Design a protein around this ligand. Sequence first.
Ligand SMILES: CCCCCCCCCCCCCCCC(=O)OC[C@H](CO[C@@H]1O[C@H](CS(=O)(=O)O)[C@@H](O)[C@H](O)[C@H]1O)OC(=O)CCCCCCCCCCCCCCC
Ligand SMILES: CCCCCCCCCCCCCCCCCC(=O)O[C@@H](COC(=O)CCCCCCCCCCCCCCC)COP(=O)(O)OC[C@H](O)CO
Lengths: 475, 168, 54, 114, 100
Amino acid sequence: GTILPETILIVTLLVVLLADLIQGRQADRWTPYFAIVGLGGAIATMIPLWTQPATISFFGSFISDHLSLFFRGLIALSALGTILMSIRYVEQTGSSLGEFMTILLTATVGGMFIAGAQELVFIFVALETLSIASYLLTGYTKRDSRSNEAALKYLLIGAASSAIFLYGSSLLYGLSGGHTQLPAIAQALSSESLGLVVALVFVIAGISFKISAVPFHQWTPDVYEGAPTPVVAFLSVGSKAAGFALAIRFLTLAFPSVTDQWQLIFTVLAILSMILGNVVALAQTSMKRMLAYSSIGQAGFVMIGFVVGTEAGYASMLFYLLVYLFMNLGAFTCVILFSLRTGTDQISEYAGLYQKDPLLTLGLSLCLLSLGGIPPLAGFFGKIYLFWAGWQAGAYGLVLLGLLTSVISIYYYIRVVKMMVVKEPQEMSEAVRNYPELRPLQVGLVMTVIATSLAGILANPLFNLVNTAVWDVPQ
Amino acid sequence: MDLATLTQTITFFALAAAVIIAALGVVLLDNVVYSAFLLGGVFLSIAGLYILMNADFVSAAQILIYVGAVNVLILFAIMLVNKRETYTPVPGRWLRQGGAAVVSLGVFALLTKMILQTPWQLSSVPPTPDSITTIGQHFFSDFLLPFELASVLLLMALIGAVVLARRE
Amino acid sequence: RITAWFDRTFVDGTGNAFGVVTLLGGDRLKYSTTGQSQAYILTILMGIAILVIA
Amino acid sequence: VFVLSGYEYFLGFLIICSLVPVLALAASALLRPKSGRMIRLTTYESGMEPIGGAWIQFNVRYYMFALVFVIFDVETVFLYPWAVAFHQLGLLAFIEALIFIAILVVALVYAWRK
Amino acid sequence: MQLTYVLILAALLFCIGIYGLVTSRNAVRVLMSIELLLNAVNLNLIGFANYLDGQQIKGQVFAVFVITVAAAEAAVGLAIILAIYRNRDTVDMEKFNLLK
Ligand SMILES: CCCCCCCCCCCCCCCC(=O)OC[C@H](CO[C@@H]1O[C@H](CS(=O)(=O)O)[C@@H](O)[C@H](O)[C@H]1O)OC(=O)CCCCCCCCCCCCCCC
Ligand SMILES: CCCCCCCCCCCCCCCCCC(=O)O[C@@H](COC(=O)CCCCCCCCCCCCCCC)COP(=O)(O)OC[C@H](O)CO
């Protein structure tokens, strides 16, 4: 029934099969394309049903409003940016590329389904589809012990988080008679009880694991060091996209907004995220771990968009979640491009890169400064909109903490640009002293870098988009 | 106040005692294979508890999957990883053990208060006996997205597990 | 000779202490990521049953 | 409440069938020679002595053959209510079940190709 | 045999599975504890379906899906454990700590 909203997913699904059968027959294949083409077709399939029809439901089990299309396109674009980086990376490792892109595309399908899902069973199925593929991608490079320990750790944390989320879902199904639907639960239970609070906290425990809200954060620093770096790039953009989409679709629409104790819970988690993820990130030696704690901090920033939900905090949250894509894909593409050439190492080895490779420096400094919130750049306007949507509602303390943490973040984001530019020929690191002198990697790097530098001042075209998406959130 | 209800109560409490003892054996016993078999015991007891709750199909499905597929998998893997168990005691143990114990007891007390406090809607109408045809109707009318996506889930799980457990 | 010394000690130092503290607060709080997945699950379980109390 | 008709027999018969081994094996225990302890209690190694060490040279030969079994064991559970309820469904359920079976067939081909 | 009893039993099984998931040191026992947890969830679902929603049983289909995916997650978890064992040559969960 109304399977039209699925002609965006099934396309990607077809690719999952076609980029798999070709690996069964060929085993030396060009599947990186017709996978980029698959995601391009999936995204181009949204234009016919972004504005032309109204909001539609599959069977009550799926909804295709403008917010759903926004998050689906966001996750598809994250996967498109990750496919580019991971071509020469997992090929340089003695591993296959089709059996990796099938897992990546299945994770993408799960993240795209969880965006527009509005039923307990289907929500669980999409979340678990995402989580299993995330584990498999984290433990892909099975030769390194760090990758295996990271996959084991991530699996043991995520499966427990899913068990808690499932206990919450079962409680939520039992409190409101039957009604596996989300909107049919708000109509059934409309009063705070102990069962509803317990279900709420048990759902939050499984949401915050996805969006990396502390104290549910302690896996990203150990997973970002372990996982293959393009998996980390997809995991910091697409996984947060799916988590925030599910949080909006769940908390707002299912948990009757009469029980807005989750705004208190998320104020707590956002304060704690801003404080921790930016203070501890300040003392790190590897780029991937630094980016992990940075990602925790940025999730804390985003979590002041829908904690003051006022049709402008939601728009601020969505705009920062859109800009975060360009920032982090570009900040991970340069990390991959550096660890590919010779380095394969940490921050201290970046010293002196301005002499040997200036394009990588100009591409990485732009993205780190955007993450820090430097004027005209994609991050400055994102953060300014996040902070004004927070003042305009009444959350003085949250914004006054976000600003101080933004300074703390400017410090350790510019500490890397320090190494990349300062050094004279006597202070180059041992990895740059012998720096040598892959087209998709460069054509993705250039694109994300020119996007993170122009989507700040050319922001008006993608403010109407965010607003028509926010028009769908209930209040 | 009957012979049917007396049997349905005695069997429920027997299966509950079996569940508790086997589930404590799974996690407390020092030998791991005893835990691997008491796990199948847990699964069989829960399969009985389902039958006692008018769910005859899902109990047989559990017996197929849990005590017939997942249990056999766990037994194979427990055999694959035998190295005579030279676990040296670690100092920071009583801390985490005590923390786990207290957090478990507290969460259980909280859940029990929530369960005994909330007024569930019992809806005293006898359930349906033909519980498998209804599940068949819900796979293709209501739960079509999950039924269709479970196939891709199984496929990706197979792919990734063969890749991780491969030998090369 | 007092004022300069003051500037070199009390004012400057007061502006640096903050920074130094923020360094220490990061250097001795990374140890919260202990590297033990069971500890992570304990912190996740301490998240619940506390927000449930508050 | 309990409306599952046929149950009464599965419990009683489960008891009476579990009682068969624990009764034959007890009758055998009552009437049979006592101990035979000293060297009757060794492991059969074709008459020789166990070589020592006694390991197995672990192989994934029997983890993969259980992984692939779990997959299709779940497949059959998903396919049983479709087959039992193939009357009220008719067409458009055959299409979805056929998509399901095609995905599982690609899974089997992937497992058979490696 | 009431709904409250089944729910308390499921909560207690959840408790035991959590204890085993946090305390146990071997690496397969944490997976077995995760299975105990998922069973504690399925018991809630079937109890609610039997008592509250007894005509168009919807907790039982959700339970079928939970069983399916618990099997899948076990199939993946034992693979992860075999991969980590093939390199570290142990399953002592107190030796997979590459940090300070
Ligand atoms: C109308 C029926 C009335 C009774 C029927 C009972 C049938 C079964 C039990 C037979 C009576 C003797 C049983 C005692 C148990 C025991 O073994 O004691 C130990 C002594 C061993 O002697 C002992 O040997 C002992 C050492 S040792 O352990 O045996 O090695 C030693 O301590 C001892 O001094 C020495 O005497 O053995 C016996 O007493 C009998 C054991 C073998 C008897 C087999 C009878 C076969 C009957 C089955 C066929 C019938 C068909 C169906 C009928 C329903
Ligand atoms: C795979 C390994 C095992 C996994 C699962 C194990 C778990 C066991 C399964 C649990 C079984 C469930 C509970 C059984 C229900 C008992 C009560 C009952 O079933 O009600 C029936 C009636 O219940 C009984 O009368 C049974 C009670 C006696 C059973 C006691 C066990 C018998 C023990 C052996 C016999 C001993 C006799 C001599 C004792 C002095 C209903 O009758 P009906 O089927 O005809 O339907 C219509 C009904 O007639 C009227 O409308």
